[PDB]
């Protein structure tokens, strides 16, 4: 075989395997499947208007901190300017949180089940945090469609990293460098799927995963809209956390 023909044969390079290893570890170190810290949040109240906002605000604020910790471990991420790291996290946080949550989501009853009845969230809980079907229905649909992909954890953490390092985010300065970082991750994912995800599950899997990124942009836009409306009321904004205000807007 010619060097060309042989070079066309897909192979997970040592560097690409290394990238996957780092992202798996990063996820391990920032997602607690025991959910032990939820005790620390303001208590969930299920009955009054916005009764679940304090608890879900605390959950989300906690999860933003975890997203930041994961982002810092993405190969290339820290070579970005402080400003670009900030804009990428401000814009992606809600999306990565939606991705992370797929781990607790269950299609048994279409809820996020975090180990106990107190920490099991359904569409009614989300509405009681100030959100409407315009966000919630598509969010459930997203969770269902993602679950249907039955991603390998490898693919799950690659997707989160690709989500974070997106060059077309608002406020991005060195889009060229963000794009180079993302491309290394995207190629790693494409090659992982070809070499490690057996058919039929692999069918158009990359394209399906990129469609989920597009879905996340739409969810982000609608969340931002409802969040601005929600936070416009000072009495609501009072119930949020300082980190949520800084990241999602004030």
């Amino acid at each position: 075989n010619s060097p060309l023909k042989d070079s066309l044969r897909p192979k997970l390079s040592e560097e690409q395997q290394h990238i996957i290893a780092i992202l798996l570890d990063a996820h391990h170190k920032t997602y607690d499947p025991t959910y032990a810290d939820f005790r620390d949040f303001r208590p969930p109240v299920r009955m009054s208007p916005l009764s679940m906002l304090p608890h879900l605000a605390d959950l989300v604020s906690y999860s933003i901190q975890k997203v930041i910790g994961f982002a810092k471990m993405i190969p290339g991420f820290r070579d970005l300017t402080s400003d670009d790291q900030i804009v990428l996290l401000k814009s992606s946080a809600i999306e990565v949180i939606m991705l992370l949550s797929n781990q607790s989501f269950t299609m048994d009853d279409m809820s996020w089940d975090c180990g106990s009845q107190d920490y099991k969230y359904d569409v009614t809980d989300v509405s009681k945090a100030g959100h409407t079907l315009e966000l919630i229905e598509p969010l459930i649909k997203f969770q269902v469609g993602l679950k249907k992909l039955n991603l390998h954890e490898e693919e799950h953490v690659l997707l989160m990293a690709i989500c974070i390092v997106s060059p077309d985010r608002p406020g991005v300065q060195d889009a060229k460098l963000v794009e180079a970082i993302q491309d290394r991750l995207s190629n790693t994912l494409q090659t992982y799927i070809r070499c490690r995800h057996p058919p039929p599950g692999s069918h158009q899997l990359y394209a399906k995963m990129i469609q989920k990124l597009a879905d996340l942009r739409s969810l982000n836009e609608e969340h931002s809209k409802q969040y601005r409306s929600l936070s416009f009321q000072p009495e609501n904004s009072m119930k949020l956390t300082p980190l949520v205000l800084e990241v999602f807007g004030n």
């Binding site: 930041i68 910790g69 402080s82 900030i86 996290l89 300082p242 980190l243 800084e246 990241v247």
Partner: peptide, 11 residues
């Protein structure tokens, strides 16, 4: 725009 807490968590 100043994101002190984000900036500090990123250090």
């Amino acid at each position: 725009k100043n994101h002190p807490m984000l900036m500090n968590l990123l250090k």
